[PDB]
Design a binder for this molecule. Structure first.
Ligand SMILES: CC(=O)N[C@H]1[C@@H](OP(=O)(O)OP(=O)(O)OC[C@H]2O[C@@H](n3ccc(=O)[nH]c3=O)[C@H](O)[C@@H]2O)O[C@H](CO)[C@@H](O)[C@@H]1O
Ligand SMILES: *[C@H](C)[C@H](O)P(=O)(O)O
Length: 419
């Protein structure tokens, strides 16, 4: 298993060009299963989840090719059962189900994998497809969906906010007979991006970005070209990298309006932030951040995908800060690893009480998920000495070229094979 060896401390400063969103590219690639004509999806990041997705689509009979763009021809899709080996390596695999049943009348997918930060059920996806008329049965380790003829539009009220289920329902609804109204829909920027990609193929969707999405089903979707929006979590990660290291960083190919809460929280921490149409700069002026209070919640509130990174920020900040995680139940394992690097924190139910220290110390650390792993690498950049972060393949799932980007910002980093 590869590891990153980091020698700190190093100020992280300069510029970085943000890649397309991991979490918009994924639902768009699965939505392309609905397309009868060639599709070109632009600005797709080179991530392990994207590679897994391309392999999964190919196994269903999709013809896929990629470079910066990914080309999809789903005209000959003819196998409606997704293989367990690909399905279980990430979360996005659940999105194959709705498109398959909506377009072909049937689809089978195993329970997904992905960030091991909670039980992460898919009951809401099941709920929504059933509301659209699909029969759902759990057999042989598969979630099997089927319908005789078209799905039927429905007024669907979500009992809980779910990014994934909102995408599943909105996507399947595009080929349903009639109108679907999703109430209490997730508002994430990736949902807006997926909706607009669907519309480019001929779908009729309005309300994306709000809590109510209305879809008017059509007979079929064609093809088209669509550019994936910038990755707000990769952006937030590098803004935090500047903030915790006293540097100034300018993020290019950014979309400022997807980060209102994160930018506001960084300003509370003392950051001097400026934004333009497609860029964001952050200058800490060499100053230590001020501790802040953070509570994760559905977009547009502070994102759980920036939680581990802000935990690191508070742990090197001046004063006592708070991190409250309301979305996932097992997303604090980066904490004991940072404590081994010298941090001071107490976990109390779904909250971490942070007591910032001036400097962290290098150590052999490991996280079992994407954002926590990236956070340990940032901690290594600012700690004194050598930090070795094990199992960094987790980072490959969500960051394109994090090694080259961090090195361009000043990091002393090396990828090693290790034992
Ligand atoms: C591939 C992708 O886009 N991943 C993102 C997506 O995941 P994901 O789509 O899984 O996020 P969800 O919004 O669906 O989950 C939010 C909450 O709802 C629960 N839930 C979800 C679905 C369901 O059927 N039942 C249920 O109980 C969850 O386990 C969690 O406690 O949004 C998360 C929250 O912003 C991000 O942190 C993930 O990086
Ligand atoms: C970590 C939560 C990743 O984004 P997912 O793909 O598993 O959701």
């Amino acid at each position: 298993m590869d590891k990153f060896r980091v020698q700190g401390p190093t100020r992280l400063q300069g510029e970085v060009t943000i890649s397309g969103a991991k979490n918009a590219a994924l639902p768009i690639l699965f939505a392309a299963l609905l397309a009868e004509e060639p599709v070109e999806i632009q600005n797709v990041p080179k991530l392990k989840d994207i590679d897994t997705t391309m392999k999964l689509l190919t196994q269903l009979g999709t013809k896929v090719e990629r470079x910066g763009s990914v080309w999809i021809d789903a005209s000959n899709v003819n196998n409606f059962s997704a293989p367990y080996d690909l399905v279980k390596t990430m979360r996005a695999s659940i999105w194959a189900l709705g498109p398959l049943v909506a377009r072909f009348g049937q689809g089978q997918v195993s329970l997904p994998g992905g960030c091991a930060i909670g039980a992460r059920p898919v009951d809401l996806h099941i709920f929504g497809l059933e509301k659209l008329g699909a029969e759902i049965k759990l057999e042989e380790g598969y979630v099997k969906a089927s319908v005789n003829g078209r799905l039927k539009g429905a007024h669907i009220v979500m009992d809980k906010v779910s990014v994934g289920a909102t995408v599943t329902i909105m996507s399947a609804a595009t080929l349903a007979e009639g109108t679907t109204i999703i109430e209490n829909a997730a508002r994430e920027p990736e949902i807006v991006d997926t909706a607009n990609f669907l519309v480019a193929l001929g779908a009729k969707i309005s309300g994306q970005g709000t809590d109510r999405i209305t879809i008017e089903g059509v007979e079929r979707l064609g093809g088209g070209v669509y550019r994936v929006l910038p990755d707000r979590i990769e952006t937030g990660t590098f803004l935090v990298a500047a903030a915790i290291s006293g540097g100034k960083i300018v993020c290019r190919n950014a979309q400022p309006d997807t980060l209102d809460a994160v930018l506001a929280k960084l300003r509370e921490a003392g950051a001097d932030i400026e934004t333009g149409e497609d860029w964001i700069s952050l200058d800490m002026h060499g100053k230590r951040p001020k501790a802040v209070t953070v509570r994760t919640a559905p977009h547009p509130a502070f994102p759980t995908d920036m939680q581990a990174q802000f935990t690191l920020l508070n742990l090197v900040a001046e004063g006592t800060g708070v991190i409250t995680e309301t979305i996932f139940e097992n997303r604090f394992m980066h904490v004991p690893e940072l404590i081994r690097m010298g941090a001071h924190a107490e976990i109390e139910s779904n909250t971490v009480i942070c007591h910032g220290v001036e400097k962290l110390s290098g150590a052999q650390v490991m996280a079992t998920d994407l954002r926590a792993s990236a956070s340990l690498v940032l901690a290594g950049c600012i700690a004194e000495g050598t930090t070795v972060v094990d199992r960094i393949y987790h980072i490959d799932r969500g960051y394109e070229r994090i090694e080259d980007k961090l090195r361009a910002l000043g990091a002393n980093i090396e990828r090693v094979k290790g034992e």
